[PDB]
Design a protein around this nucleic acid. Structure first.
Length: 109
DNA sequence: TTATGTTTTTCTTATGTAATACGTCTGTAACTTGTTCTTATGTCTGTTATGTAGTTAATATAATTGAAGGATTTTAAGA
């Protein structure tokens, strides 16, 4: 499965890495590989697409057995957008009091 | 005796972890602003009450109205 994101971004499940490509399976302009928690967050946001993803769902999926201080929620989804280079805050959207969403262009299965 | 492979230790970095501080989005409120329906009222008009002006041909030809045990003093008009 290949998820397409704005600015011609791609996250791959046929592999385990993110890139800026115009060819789905071809590794063009590699970003790298997200961490375990980053990959889990990206998977959760892509699965809840096109619906908004609730905050409690994210915290109980990323940290099933962790006493999260309620502020790692924002540091994590700040550096996740930074690692995808979302300087304009357009790649991942926050709808207030409803949750988060990630802008997916197309899905390749 | 000495060169070298190894293993353990310590330093360096990386992902997460949290704390406090401050900006954004959004939810309510103050301030106006346009539109439509309603209402009290000022004004015009018709109808009836009323207020005014006029006329009437035996003859008839100088009030009235009390008013009633007042004393005392002052001052103008008559002679």
């Amino acid at each position: 499965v290949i998820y397409q994101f704005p600015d011609n971004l791609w996250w791959n499940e046929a592999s385990n890495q993110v890139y800026y490509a115009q060819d789905p399976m071809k590794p063009e302009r590699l970003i790298g590989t997200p961490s375990i928690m980053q990959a889990k967050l990206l998977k959760i946001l892509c699965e809840y697409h096109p619906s908004p993803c609730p905050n409690d769902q994210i915290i109980k999926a990323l940290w099933p057995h962790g006493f999260i201080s309620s502020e790692s929620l924002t540091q994590a989804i700040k550096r996740t957008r930074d690692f995808l280079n979302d300087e304009h805050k357009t790649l991942i959207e926050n709808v207030k009091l409803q949750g988060y969403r990630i802008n997916i262009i197309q899905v390749i299965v």
